Amino acid sequence: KSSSLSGSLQSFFTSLQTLVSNAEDPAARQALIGKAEGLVNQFKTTDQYL
Amino acid sequence: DRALGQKLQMSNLVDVDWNSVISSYVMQQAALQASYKTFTDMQGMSLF
Amino acid sequence: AQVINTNSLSLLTQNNLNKSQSALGTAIERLSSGLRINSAKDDAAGQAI
Amino acid sequence: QVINTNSLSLLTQNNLNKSQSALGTAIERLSSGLRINSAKDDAAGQAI
Amino acid sequence: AQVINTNSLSLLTQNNLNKSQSALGTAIERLSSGLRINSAKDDAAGQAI
Amino acid sequence: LTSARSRIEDSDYATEVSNMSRAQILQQAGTSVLAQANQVPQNVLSLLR
Amino acid sequence: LTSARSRIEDSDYATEVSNMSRAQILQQAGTSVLAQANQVPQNVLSLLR
Amino acid sequence: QAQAQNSQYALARTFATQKVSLEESVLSQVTTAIQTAQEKIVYAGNGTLSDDD
Amino acid sequence: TPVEGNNVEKEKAAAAIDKTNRGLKNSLNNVLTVRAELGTQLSELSTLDSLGS
């Protein structure tokens, strides 16, 4: 219960926030894409186990 | 910097952590001991 | 159904030590470098900015 | 706290530079005997 | 009780240290500049007047 | 720009130092408990024979 | 010339300090494992039965 | 969740101060410029000046 | 290319200089973006391997 889905989820929200203040920045946008990929990864990985 | 990176690279190929091997080693020592107690007891019966 | 043999308790312990080791490595690296952000692993947006 | 960047030192250096410019101006004018030593001081006044 | 994952007293102390840091910086700044007012943070209405 | 660059880049030594202490204590304690853990199979061998 | 000669001559203090420490630890480990290693025949024999 | 909330606010505040301090500095220079402009204007009110002055 | 004594060449060289300033800005931003992408993957990998272990 530290790396479980929630932990990644709030981290994605955190990256989205940091984008909200630097709207033009390409780097932040790429970072948000990556965080989204990680989030979906955890979702599907747990679903695989079930 | 490149040399440090490749140094750490080499370790991953050839080195091994001590905790893992040590932990396995002690246990397997004990397992061998119980195994031989098997022999001791069967021989002790064997005298019949 | 017990792990006296596999230890388990021992393997478990070990993994926690790995977590602590990673924490110590990060702390040492940052404290020696003087920078929180030493590589793209620290942050993406931070690196760029 | 931060080890590697003394922001306050930079700020104090900037203030030192301010005072330095004022000091240089004072000495220059004091020595020349003139307020208008160059076009910088009072351009139209210099022309007049 | 002794919790080793979080030394609460440490964070408690760190906050107060930062508290001090701010005031020291302010004092040194004012002493250097020769002005009570340096930035609008100091005194807005006074800045204007 | 120097101030902002600092706030993004630099490390806060007190934070990493306390993290260091946390990590060191964790590592030593965990190695101790791991030694006792590896003995646990010895406890059960003494149990076993 | 003095600096250039130094770069050919001198031994790096930190590097060799670390090497010496590593070597002491390795030799300690080797000696202890050797004690247990000679015990190995001792164990297997002492169990004579 | 609440911890992450506070962290997000921390990031936001960092960026906000980043903008605002710079704005203040440039405005201070602007104020100095306006002051010296006014100073020049008074000079213009002088009636003993010829046209090239 | 020498420019002294001439016109045209001085201004042409200045134009190329400004062009390169702009281009360097853009290239810097691009490289930083790629570095950001790599950093994100680099961070993700450690979480993945802890999961696996």
Chain I contact present for C42, CB below 8 A: yes
> In this structure, what are the phi and psi dihedrals at residue D31, rounded to the nearest 5 degrees?
-75, -45
**Directed axis angle between helix H2-44 and helix A5-20, to 10°?**
10
Q: For I29-49, what is the HEC assignment? A: HHHHHHHHHHHHHHHHHHHHH
Elucidation technique: cryo-EM
Give which of G36, B34, G47, G33 is closest to F41, Cα–Cα.
B34
Cβ neighbour number for residue F15 with a 10 Å cutoff: 17
Say which residues have a Cβ less than 8 Å from residue D42's Cβ, sequence separation at least 6. D35, D36
The total of other beta-carbon atoms located within 10 Å of residue A18's CB is 23
Neighbours of G47 (CB within 10 A): 13
- Residues in contact with E39: Cβ distance below 8 Å, sequence separation at least 6, in sequence order: H21, H24, H25, H28
Other Cβ atoms less than 10 A from the Cβ of F48: the count is 14
Contacts of C5 in chain B (CB under 8 A): 27, 31
Name residue, tokens 């992408």.
I37
What is the CB neighbour count within 10 angstroms for residue H3? Answer: 8
Residues of I in contact with C41 (CB under 8 A): 39, 42-43
- Distance (Å, whole) CA I19 – CA I12: 11
Q: Are A14 and H7 in contact (CB under 8 A)?
A: yes
H or E segment and range at residue D48: none
d(CA C48, CA F26): 35
- State how far the Cα of E40 lies from the Cα of E37, in Å rounded to an integer: 8
Three-class SS state of D2: strand
CB-defined contacts C:F, below 8 A: 70
Mutation target among F18, F19, F21 for the E interface, most CBs of E within 10 A: F18
A12 contacts A36 by C-beta, under 8 angstroms: yes
Shortest CA gap F27–chain C (Å): 6
CB-CB neighbors (< 8 A) of F32 in chain E: none
Q: Give bridge partners of residue C35 from the DSSP assignment.
A: F10
Q: How far is B39 from chain C (nearest CA, A)?
A: 20
* Two tokens, residue B8: 């750490």
The pair of structure tokens assigned to G37 is 């290693």
Amino acid letter at I49? D
Three-class HEC string of C1-49: CCCCCCCCHHHHHHHHHHHHHHHHHHHHHHHHHCECCCCCCCCCHHHHC
Around Cβ A28, how many Cβ atoms within 10 Å? 24
Phi, psi of F10 (to 5 degrees): -75, 175
Task: State how far the Cα of G42 lies from the Cα of C31, in Å rounded to an integer.
Answer: 49
Q: What tokens were used for B25? A: 């080693």
Q: For residues B29 and B26, what is the distance between their CA atoms, to the nearest angstrom?
A: 5
Cα–Cα distance measured from residue A16 to residue A23, given in angstroms and rounded to the nearest whole number: 10
PDB resolution in Å: 2.9
The Cα–Cα gap between C6 and F38 comes to: 10
Helix, coil or strand: residue F12:
strand
The answer to whether C40 contacts I53, with C-beta atoms less than 8 Å apart, is: no
Q: Does residue F10 sit in helix, strand or coil?
A: strand
Distance CA H45, CA F45 (A): 107
The distance between the two most distant Cα atoms of chain I, rounded to a whole number of Å, is: 73
Q: Which residue matches tokens 């990985």?
A: A45
Query: Would you call F45 and B26 a contact, using CB atoms and an 8 Å cutoff?
Result: no
